[PDB]
Design a protein around this ligand. Structure first.
Ligand SMILES: [Mg+2]
Ligand SMILES: [Mg+2]
Ligand SMILES: [Mg+2]
Ligand SMILES: [Mg+2]
Ligand SMILES: [Mg+2]
Ligand SMILES: [Mg+2]
Lengths: 182, 127, 260
RNA sequence: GGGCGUCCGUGAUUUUUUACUGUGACUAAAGAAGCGUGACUAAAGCAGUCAUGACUGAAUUAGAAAG
RNA sequence: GAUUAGGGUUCGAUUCCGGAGAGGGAGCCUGAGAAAUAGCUACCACUUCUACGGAGGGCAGCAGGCGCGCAAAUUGCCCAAUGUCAAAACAAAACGAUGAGGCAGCGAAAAGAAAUAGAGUUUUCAAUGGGGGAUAUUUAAACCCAUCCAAUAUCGAGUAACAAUUGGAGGACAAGUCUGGUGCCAGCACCCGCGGUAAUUCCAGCUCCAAAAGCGUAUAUUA
RNA sequence: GAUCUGGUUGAUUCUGCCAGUAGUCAUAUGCUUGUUUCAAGGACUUAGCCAUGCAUGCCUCAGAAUCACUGCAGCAGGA
C-alpha cells in the first residue's frame, strides 16, 4: 500500500475509431515496418506528439529566455542523438515537421533491416527477439529499441549467437545428439 | 565458434578500505565468456583471494550478484577482512550460514510467540 | 509525542530514496532542529559509506567512534547540523557540516587546526541566576560569560577543545554572511543593507562576489567573516557562487564528452 | 579648536488611505513539468561512470487566495 | 487525481500532513504527555465459561469467520532491510521484541515490454523461446527474474496439435447486392430502423472488418 | 488536434434534445489469456457481528542473584 513506484501510459487510442483514411495509413505502417499491432504506432504518435507540443511551447517563448536556451537545446540534442534530425536541422522548427515514419526508422527492427543483417523487416524482428543482435556487445531483445546515431556503427550479430561466434543452435544440436546415439 | 576452456577473469570497481569494522569493501564484477550457467560464489572467492593476496581464502565475503542480461558477466559486492576472527565478529548470521560456519537456526518464531503468551499468566519459577 | 518519521516527510536534503523502507531516523531533540539537521545514521551510512545498513551503523556509533564537536556521540539519531565538526579518530578524517550552494549539506574536509574552532550564532541573550549574562546559540550552547560586545545577531568563534570563546564577529554592514535558509541557502555574500521593520521580520540585502544581489530574512544570515576574502571558516568547493542553470548544464555535457 | 556630513536610540513640530501594477522575502515530500543517465528498451529509479581509487551526480521550474 | 486551447467541470474512504474515534455514552487513575481503550469504573445493547457460588468479553491491528451486498485476497514465511522501543554495538556457553514493516500466495483494478514464426529452391535449410532442468545464482530461506544446455562432459517445435479471442459486415462506423432457415413469428436494433415467403439487419455456414492477450456490456463521471 | 456525426420534412432552412464517439490510478460483470516487469486490493452496503492464533516490551563492562539452577576449580553463565 505504501509503495511509491510510479507508472503512466505511453499510448493513446484515437478519437474516431473508424476513419477510412487513418486505417489505410496505419496498415501501411504495420506493413512497411513489421509491426505487431496498431498500439505500437500509437505510442510513436504520443512520443512525437509530446515533442511537437513542447517545441511549440518554446516558440511562444522568446529567444534569450531561460526555458528556451536550456530545454530547447535538450530537445534538439535528443533528435540529433537518436537520428530524428540530421545535424543541419538545428533551428527547433524541424521538430514540428517530424513524422511517424521518421521515428519508426530508428527502431532496431528497421536498422537491422537497413544495415543488411536480415533479408526482410520480418526477418529482423525475429532475429532481435531470438537473441541474435548486440548493439554494443549487449544482446538487445527489444524490437522497439530506438537506436542512437553512435550505436549504428556497432550493431552486429551477438557474440553468443550461433550466427556470430557462439555455439550452434537447436536444429543442429538436436541433430548432433541423434547422430550420437548411433 | 572455437571451443576453449571457460575462463573467469575478475575485476574490482570501486574499492574502499574500511578502518572501522576492519575490512576492505568494494564491488566486484566477474567476466565469464563461454561459461555454462552462473559462476559459483565459492569459485569467485578463491580467485579474489589470489588477486589481493589474502592469507586465508575463507575470509573473503561475497554477497548478492546480478548477472547481466545477455550473459557474459555478473557484478556483486565484495568484502575482505583483516582477520578471519574479525569475519566471524562483524558479518551477519545469514552470510555466515552461507559460508558453513554459523549459528543454527532458532525455533520457528510462531512457537516462541505462543509460549511467551502462556507465560504471561504465570508468576513463579514455573516459567 | 511523535517518535517516527516517514521517509516522505523526512527532509529532502538527506536524500533517502523513497523505495527503501517506510521510515527515516527521526532525530532526537538536542542541538539542532529536526527540519535542519542531518542525523548521524545518515552521515555514517548514506553520506560516508562506512556502513552498509543501520546494523553496521550502530556497530560504529555505539562503540564510541564518531565524535561530534570533540565528544563521542553514541546516538544514531543525534542531530548534527550546520557548523558542526565530525571527527573520526580511527579513519583519521574530520569534516564540517556546511551548506553547499545548492542548499544541501556538505562535508568539508578539515585539518587539525581548522577542526578545533567552530563558528556559532547567538540566538538569545539573557541574564541567569547570579548576575551572569549567558548567550544562547543556534547549536544549543549556553556560553556563560561571552564577550561583552555580544548582541543577538553576532557570531562567536568557540574552539570546542578548550571551551573558551576566542573571538567575536559583529553583525554590521561591512561583513560577509552565509545564508542558512530559504531559496538562497548556501550562498555567501557581503551585507549591503539591513531593513529593520520592527514587529516583523528584518530583511537583509546581500551582494555576492560576482555582484549578484539577493535578499533574505536576517534571521537566515550567518556572519562568517569580516569580508569575502577573510572568511573565518572554510566553505565548500563552489564557495557560495551560484552558477547559471544553463551554463552549469553545458559544462557537464562538455566534461562527459571530454572524458570519452 | 570650528565647518561638513553620516550611524544609532529619545523628545517637540499639522493630516491620507484602498483596489490596481512592477519587483522582491517567505512558502514539506510524494505528484506535475524536465536536466543528465542505453537499469537490454520502456513503465521506472536516483543512480552510477571510468582504469588496494578516481570524478562524482541527485541541476532547475510552476504550484490557489490571504499574510 | 481525471479531463482540459483558454476560461473551466468534476473526484479526493485511500499511502504524506492534520483532525476525530475504538461497540454506543460517560467518568477517571497513573504519568512529562491520555479524558488512553491489546488501561480502569459504571450503565445501555449484544456476549462467552461455570462444579450455579461465580468469572469474563470488545479485530474501524494482521490473517481469517458469518452476514451484507454489484462489489474486494493467505487463520502464509521472516526481522535480512526500513524503523521504533530500551538497561541495549557485534562477537564470545551467549541470536532483545515487533501481523510496524518486508517477503511470498491469491490478484485481466490500472500500467510497461512482448511470442503464436522466419529464409529459400510441391520441397528442404536454419532459428529460440513456452516448457524441462543445474557446478549453480538469487533470497533471511525459498520463489522470480538472469545466466546456461558443456567448461573434459548437459533436454527439446512442426498439423511448430505448443491450435487467439472478443465484438461486427444497411447508416453513423471499418467491412458481403454470398448461401441455407424462419415468415411482423422467433428475435435484432444505444438511435434510425430490420422481420408480413426472394431479410444488405434475425438464427446459422462461408468470407471479410476492427481492436487484439485481450474484447464486449451496465452505472457513475470529464470532454 | 480550439474537429463533430446520425434521428422531426414530400424535400428545405432552423431551434432543440435524444443517439453515436473518446477518456477515468472508476467500479462491477460476461467471454477469453502463452511469457515477463510493475502494482491497487471489505472504502462505498453494515463505524455491522466476531470463533482461534498473533499484534509491546527492554540487561550492558557499568541498579538488585544464596534458584535448595548450571558448568569450572571462588570465578563465569544465569531462570
Ligand atoms: Mg543464447
Ligand atoms: Mg493519518
Ligand atoms: Mg446506547
Ligand atoms: Mg481484519
Ligand atoms: Mg437471405
Ligand atoms: Mg450473418
Amino acid at each position: 500500500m505504501r509503495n511509491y513506484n510510479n507508472f503512466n501510459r505511453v499510448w493513446k487510442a484515437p478519437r474516431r475509431p473508424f476513419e477510412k483514411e487513418r486505417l489505410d495509413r496505419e496498415m501501411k505502417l504495420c506493413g512497411q515496418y513489421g509491426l505487431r499491432c496498431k498500439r505500437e504506432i500509437w505510442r510513436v504518435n504520443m512520443t512525437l506528439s509530446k515533442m511537437r507540443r513542447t517545441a511549440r511551447l518554446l516558440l511562444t517563448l522568446p529567444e534569450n529566455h531561460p526555458r528556451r536556451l536550456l530545454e530547447g537545446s535538450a530537445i534538439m540534442r535528443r533528435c540529433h542523438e537518436y537520428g530524428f534530425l540530421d545535424e543541419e536541422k538545428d533551428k527547433l522548427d524541424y521538430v514540428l515537421s517530424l513524422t511517424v515514419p521518421d521515428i519508426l526508422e530508428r527502431r532496431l527492427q528497421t536498422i537491422v533491416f537497413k544495415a543488411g543483417l536480415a533479408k526482410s523487416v520480418h526477418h529482423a524482428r525475429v532475429l532481435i527477439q531470438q537473441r541474435h543482435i548486440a548493439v554494443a556487445k549487449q544482446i538487445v531483445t527489444i524490437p522497439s529499441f530506438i537506436v542512437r546515431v553512435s550505436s549504428e556503427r556497432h550493431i552486429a550479430f551477438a557474440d553468443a549467437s550461433p550466427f556470430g561466434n557462439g555455439r550452434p543452435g537447436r536444429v543442429k544440436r538436436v541433430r548432433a545428439k541423434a547422430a550420437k546415439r548411433h | 565458434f572455437q571451443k576453449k576452456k571457460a575462463e573467469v577473469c575478475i575485476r574490482t570497481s570501486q574499492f574502499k578500505v574500511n578502518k572501522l569494522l576492519n575490512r576492505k569493501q568494494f564491488i566486484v564484477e566477474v567476466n565469464h565468456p563461454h561459461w555454462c550457467g552462473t559462476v559459483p560464489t565459492q569459485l569467485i572467492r578463491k580467485k579474489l583471494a589470489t588477486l589481493y593476496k589474502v592469507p586465508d581464502a575463507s575470509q573473503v565475503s561475497l554477497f548478492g550478484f546480478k548477472t547481466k542480461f545477455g550473459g557474459g558477466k555478473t557484478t556483486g559486492f565484495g568484502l575482505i577482512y583483516d582477520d578471519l576472527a574479525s569475519l566471524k565478529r562483524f558479518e551477519p548470521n545469514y552470510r555466515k550460514t552461507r559460508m558453513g560456519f554459523g549459528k543454527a537456526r532458532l525455533p520457528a518464531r510462531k512457537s516462541v510467540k505462543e509460549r511467551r503468551n502462556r507465560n504471561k499468566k504465570l508468576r513463579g519459577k514455573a516459567k | 509525542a511523535k517518535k517516527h518519521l516517514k521517509r516522505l516527510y523526512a527532509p529532502k536534503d538527506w536524500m533517502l530514496s523513497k523505495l527503501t523502507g517506510v521510515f527515516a531516523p527521526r532525530p532526537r531533540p538536542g542541538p539542532h532542529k529536526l527540519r535542519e539537521c542531518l542525523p548521524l545514521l545518515v552521515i555514517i551510512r548514506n553520506r560516508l559509506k562506512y556502513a552498509l545498513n543501520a546494523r553496521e551503523g550502530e556497530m560504529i556509533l555505539r562503540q564510541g567512534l564518531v565524535h561530534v564537536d570533540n565528544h563521542p556521540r553514541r546516538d544514531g539519531k543525534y542531530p548534527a547540523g550546520f557548523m558542526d565538526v565530525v571527527e573520526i579518530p580511527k579513519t583519521g578524517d574530520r569534516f564540517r557540516l556546511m551548506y553547499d550552494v545548492k542548499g544541501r549539506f556538505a562535508l568539508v574536509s578539515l585539518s587539525e587546526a581548522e577542526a578545533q574552532i567552530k563558528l556559532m550564532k547567538v540566538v538569545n541573550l539573557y541574564t541567569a541566576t547570579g548576575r551572569v549574562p549567558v548567550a544562547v546559540t543556534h547549536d544549543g550552547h549556553r556560553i556563560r560569560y561571552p564577550d561583552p560586545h555580544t548582541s543577538i545577531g553576532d557570531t562567536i568563534v568557540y574552539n570546542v577543545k578548550e571551551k573558551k570563546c576566542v573571538d567575536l564577529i559583529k553583525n554590521r554592514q561591512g561583513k560577509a554572511v552565509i545564508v542558512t535558509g530559504g531559496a538562497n541557502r548556501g550562498r555567501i555574500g557581503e551585507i549591503v543593507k539591513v531593513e529593520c521593520h520592527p514587529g516583523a521580520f528584518n530583511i537583509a540585502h546581500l551582494k555576492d562576489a560576482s555582484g549578484a544581489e539577493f535578499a533574505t530574512r536576517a534571521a537566515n544570515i550567518f556572519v562568517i567573516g569580516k569580508d569575502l576574502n577573510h572568511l573565518q571558516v572554510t566553505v565548500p568547493k563552489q564557495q557560495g557562487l551560484r552558477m547559471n542553470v544553463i551554463q552549469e548544464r553545458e559544462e557537464r555535457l562538455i566534461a562527459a564528452e571530454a572524458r570519452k
